[PDB]
Amino acid sequence: LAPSVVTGVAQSSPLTIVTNPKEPRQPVPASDGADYLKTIPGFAVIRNGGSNGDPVLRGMFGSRLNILTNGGMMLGACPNRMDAPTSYISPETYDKLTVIKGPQTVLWGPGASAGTILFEREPERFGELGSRVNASLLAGSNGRFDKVLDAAAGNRLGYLRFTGNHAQSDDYEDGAGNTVPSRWKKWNGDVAVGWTPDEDTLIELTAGKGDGEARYAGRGMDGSQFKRESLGLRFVKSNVSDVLEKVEAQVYYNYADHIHDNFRLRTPDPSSMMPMPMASQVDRRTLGGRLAATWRWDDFKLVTGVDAMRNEHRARGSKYDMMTDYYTDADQFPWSKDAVFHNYGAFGELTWFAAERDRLIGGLRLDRASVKDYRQTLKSGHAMANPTANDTRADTLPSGFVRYEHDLADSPTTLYAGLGHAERFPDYWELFSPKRGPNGSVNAFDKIKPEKTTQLDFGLQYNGDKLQAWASGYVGVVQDFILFSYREGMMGSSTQATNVDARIMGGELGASYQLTGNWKTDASLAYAWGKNSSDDRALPQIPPLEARFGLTYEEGDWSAGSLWRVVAPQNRIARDQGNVVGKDFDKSAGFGVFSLNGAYRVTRNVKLSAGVDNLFDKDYTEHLNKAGDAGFGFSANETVPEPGRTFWTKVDFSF
Ligand SMILES: [Cu+]
């Protein structure tokens, strides 16, 4: 029961990873959800600056990941994804993090072709009047300071919960001694009110808000505001009849209000195409809901239900009267709506427990998706007509999967193989952000097709006594993979969205071995591969082969760890192609990074941990990081470097 620092998370059951995000993590995360995914093999992160990275799973970017918080969807507003869904999540304020790899669930929404990520808080369990406090403080290099408070009180009949955090860092340094533009601040406060009139009934109301700022080495602008407001209502009814085990009902409202500019966290670049102050303000308003029934009987479990979603995007921008040298801020103009999305779906998942060592799971959903272009004009001696103003388009998209899981007779082994098909309607960035659509189209909104993935997943679990191992591989094809291509034109850079066909394959594996009662070791490996077979070319933005080796010594109340991370070169690139955020340009160099950690339980209630990240102060960058901005002194296509040696200390309280 000795405390330790988390450097990797294993796969605990076929395709699924479950972890407590309150444990200290050894490459210390920045209070965002992308960094908490770095310890799960198969995840990589596009670095923008000090925080708010964009998560990449098995080489898949963006909405191919379905990222939920308490069952709801929080979508960002930045047309350049400065505020990806994970940038609104502070994972320490949650209780559980679940990842399901591959298109192997239908219960949580449309289009999760790459995987599903679920951040959860679990309702209190008070049986008598009482209270609960969890908290933590973290301090480290470069002004890093974090506070987290999670308190609740209640009784058999109901409860009140408050969770909040405040977190910040100054600019960090790379391993060559340069200050990287990358300071950030984040804070959140949320309340939950729970009513439990009896054991079979839970009704819970939630409301919360947060804000932040972030300096972006890899952008022409910084994020000076990331406002979030959230409202939720969920209802669980248990043991309704002998076969109706559970009924779930949930609605959520999430509002993002984002500002980026070139003068609040930097000064305007004199040699850029924005030498004058400029700010843009955008928001995203999201309303959605879910209703699901769970039936159990004989050797069968059936989960059935429907879900719905609507979201809306608006924007307004500042103006700079050159002649009088006068600046009118963006909040002096009306909001201007530009897009509305809708989705309605019906879904079901049946499970058969054949005998005791055999499981068969099948799932299906049908989705009705639609979008409307509300842009009355476009940008380009200022504006131009939008040829699809007020147009609508829609599609209906079936998805499903089958999965077989067999447990061996002799060893504690599970084998599994699964077939999944997933169809995803294009998202805001794929339709509204490209400057051009496919050749011969009027724009991207009018022509980009839905993306259709067919994938075979397979793997094994070995749950031995000294040895714990797992592996998970996948082969698939993507029809109408949505791809970005980049051109110069001496107008800045400009993008084109196209549909192409693709092959993908890869996998993750890992093991941990209890050497002695004190000594444990573990390792992991992750590989992704992709081909643009429409163009006989590699897919862009695929992270290279990556390995982790850990060693831990634990002894009563304390433990000590060492971690090695070793990353291969990525020589498979597609220059000037990528997504809405990034593009390939050069092959990447391989590297190794080394870290140490320790932990110590002082009392039942107080536990301590500390680490040194990147002990040897290695100067390195990752394949997927953004190119640095010229106005900060970055040449060429020099990508943002990773941090050099950093120290941190954490104390966890629990009462
Ligand atoms: Cu932005």
Q: Rounded to the nearest whole angstrom, what is the distance from the C-alpha of residue 537 to the centroid of ligand 1?
A: 31
Strand order in the sheet with 54-57: 43-46, 54-57, 60-61
Ligand 1 mean position, distance from CA 378 (Å): 18
- Compute, in angstroms, the gap from residue 168 CA to the centroid of ligand 1: 19
307 CA to middle of ligand 1, Å? 29
φ/ψ (deg, to 5) at 276: -105, 160
Q: Are 574 and 584 in contact (CB under 8 A)?
A: yes
Query: What is the domain extent for residue 149?
Result: 16-654
What CA–CA distance (Å, rounded) separates 296 from 316?
A: 51
Instruction: Tell me the C-alpha to C-alpha distance, in Å, between residue 368 and each of 100, 110, 113, 284.
Output: 23, 9, 17, 21
CA–CA gap between residue 645 and residue 641 (Å, rounded): 13
Examine residue 10 and state whether it is found in any structural domain, yes or no.
no
Extract the tokens encoding 565.
């991370």
Q: How many angstroms is it from 483 CA to the middle of ligand 1?
A: 21
**Is residue 7 in a domain?**
no
Q: What angle do CA 160, 163, 165 make, to 5 degrees?
A: 160
Domain count, the chain: 1
CA 414, CA 363: separation in Å to the nearest integer?
21
Q: Is residue 1 part of a domain?
A: no
Q: What's the CATH number where 386 sits?
A: 2.40.170.20
d(CA 182, CA 48): 8
Find how far residue 174's CA is from the centre of its chain: 24
Q: How many CA atoms lie within 13 A of 140 on its CB side?
A: 28
**Spatial separation of the C-alpha atoms in residues 373 and 371, rounded to whole Å:** 7
Tell me the chain's radius of gyration from C-alpha atoms.
Answer: 25
What are the angstrom distances between the C-alpha of 270 and each of 25, 196, 221, 289, 627? 41, 61, 14, 48, 19
Q: What is the spatial distance between Cα 596 and Cα 269, in angstroms, rounded to a whole number?
A: 40
CA of 1 to the centre of ligand 1 (A): 44
CB 287 within 8 A of CB 235: no
Evaluate whether 398 touches 426 at the Cβ level (below 8 Å).
no
Phi, psi of 64 (to 5 degrees): -65, -15
Tell me whether residue 312 is in a domain. Answer: yes
Residues near 379 by beta carbon (within 8 Å), at least 6 away in sequence: none
Report the distance separating Cα 600 and Cα 560, nearest Å: 9
Q: How many CB atoms lie within 10 A of CB 639?
A: 23
Distances (CA, A) of 373 to 314, 316, 386, 391, 394: 11, 16, 9, 6, 12
Q: CA 468, CA 563: separation in Å to the nearest integer?
A: 18
Using alpha carbons, select from 189, 284, 214, 254 the residue that is nearest to residue 35: 214
Q: Which residues of 436-472 are buried (b: 16+ CB within 10 A; e: fewer)?
A: bbbeebebbbebbebbbbbbebbbbbeeeeeebbbbb
Spatial separation of the C-alpha atoms in residues 262 and 279, rounded to whole Å? 7
Instruction: Tell me if 621 is assigned to some domain.
Output: yes
The rounded distance, in Å, linking the Cα atoms of 125 and 172 is 42
DSSP-derived pairing of the beta strands 646-654 and 130-140: antiparallel
Spatial contact of 422 and 452, defined as CB atoms under 8 Å apart = yes
Q: Is 430 helix (H, G, I), strand (E, B) or coil?
A: helix
What DSSP character marks residue 535? Answer: T
Residue at 192 is within a domain? yes
CA atoms of 513 and 530, how far apart (whole Å)? 32
Helix (H) or strand (E) holding 485: strand 467-487
574 is a domain residue: yes
Token pair, residue 618, equals 């290695």
Enclosing H/E stretch for 580: none
CA of 514 to the centre of ligand 1 (A): 47
Residue 482 near residue 502 (C-beta atoms within 8 A): no
Q: Which amino acid is at 384?
A: M
Instruction: Give the Å distance between the CA of 367 and the centre of ligand 1.
Output: 30
Residue position matching structure tokens 């000294």: 466
DSSP classification of residue 636: T
Determination technique used:
X-ray
Alpha carbon of 260 to ligand 1 centroid (Å): 5
* Residue carrying the six token digits 């955020």: 581
Beta bridge partners of 532: 502, 537
Could you say which DSSP state residue 548 is in? E
Half-sphere exposure of 301 (CA within 13 A, CB side): 10
Q: Which residues contact 456 (CB under 8 A, 6 or more apart)?
A: 417, 418, 419, 474, 475, 476
65-69 and 115-120 beta bridge pairing: parallel
Ligand 1 centroid, distance to 82 Cα (angstroms): 5
User: 2 lies in a domain?
Assistant: no
Report the separation in Å between the CA atom of 219 and the middle of ligand 1, taken as the mean of its atom positions.
9
Q: Which of 529, 525, 521 is nearest to 547 (CA)?
A: 525
How do 144-154 and 158-169 pair as beta strands?
antiparallel
- 237 Cβ neighbours under 8 A, 6+ residues apart: 200, 201, 246, 247, 248
DSSP string spanning 151-193?
Answer: EEEE-SSEEEEEEEEEEEE--EE-TTSPEES--EEEEEEEEEE
Q: How far apart are CA 283 and CA 286, in angstroms?
A: 10
Distance 220 CA to ligand 1 centre (A): 10
